[model samples]
Target: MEWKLFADLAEVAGSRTVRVDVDGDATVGDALDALVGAHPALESRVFGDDGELYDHINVLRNGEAAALGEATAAGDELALFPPVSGG
Candidate 1:
């Protein structure tokens, strides 16, 4: 599966994107586990103490917005974006 990072996320990962192999169409959270395991540096930045994604982060699966439990697979697109706003 292909993973794309946005905003400060790409900054921390040191790359805007990366590709990871999953057993099959796996959960968005699962793909993330693989990514962070391979690039441990992103663990803390992306997941919190409870091991859940931060509230600001959004997951996109196959062009549609998805949640952690959503499924994705190889050849499918997975992108993470964290939005910020200010007055």
Candidate 2:
């Protein structure tokens, strides 16, 4: 699977996209684990104390927000975008 990082997320991962190997039945959460593992620095920004995704970060699968139990395939694309906030 390929995970695409946007904005500051790309900077954090040191690349725009990262490739990870996972089972065909892997869930979004599983992909997230591989992503964070590759870019450990992003853990604090993306995960909370309970290891859940931070509210300020948005994770998408094929341009849609990933469901809690959504299954991910090998060629699936996962995108990470930070919340946009301004006055």
Candidate 3:
């Protein structure tokens, strides 16, 4: 999957685009884990101290809201928007 980053999330990831393995029937959260794996710095920014993704961090699947459990495919486009984006 291709994950597009916005705001500080892109800054922290060091790029606006991220690639992850989401072959088969993986969930959005699974792809998120892979993104964090590739860019450890994102963990602190995307997730909160409570071990949950901060509500301000918005996940979009094909430009719409994406739930953690939402199924994702290899060709899916995912985007992460920081609080500043209001996405």
Candidate 4:
């Protein structure tokens, strides 16, 4: 699976795009773990205590907002974005 991080998240990951392999039945949370695990520096910005996604971050699975329970498959795209604050 391929994950793309945008805006501030891109900067946090030190790159705009990352490619990862996910098990067929991996959940959105699993993909997130793979992302943060590969880039440990992004852990603080992407996840909070209790293993929940940070409120200020937006996660999308194929252009739609994703719930933690969403499932992942090979060739799927996941995007992580920081909260937009501009007016």
Identify the leading candidate in terms of lDDT: 3
Q: CA shift at 50, candidate 4, in angstroms? A: 18
Off by over 4 Å in 3: 20-31, 34-39, 43-54, 63-76, 85-87
TM-score of 4: 0.41
- The whole-model lDDT of each prediction reads 0.54, 0.54, 0.55, 0.54
Model 2 clash count equals 0
Q: Compose the digit string of candidate 2's lDDT tens values, residues 21-57.
A: 6445757656565553434534345544335454465
Write down the TM-score of every candidate: 0.43, 0.40, 0.41, 0.41
* Model 3, span 1-87: residue lDDT tens: 567665454456566667655445767666565453434545445454445454455556775444457665334556655555354
Worst 10 residues of 3 by lDDT: 34-43
**Cα lDDT tens digits for candidate 1, 10-76:** 4455665667554556676565654434244354544544344544455566764434565643344
Who is ahead in lDDT, 1 or 3?
3
Candidate 2: clashing pairs of residues? none
lDDT at 20 for candidate 3? 56
Model 2 scores what on Cα lDDT?
0.54
Tell me each candidate's RMSD, in Å, in order.
6.4, 6.5, 6.4, 6.6
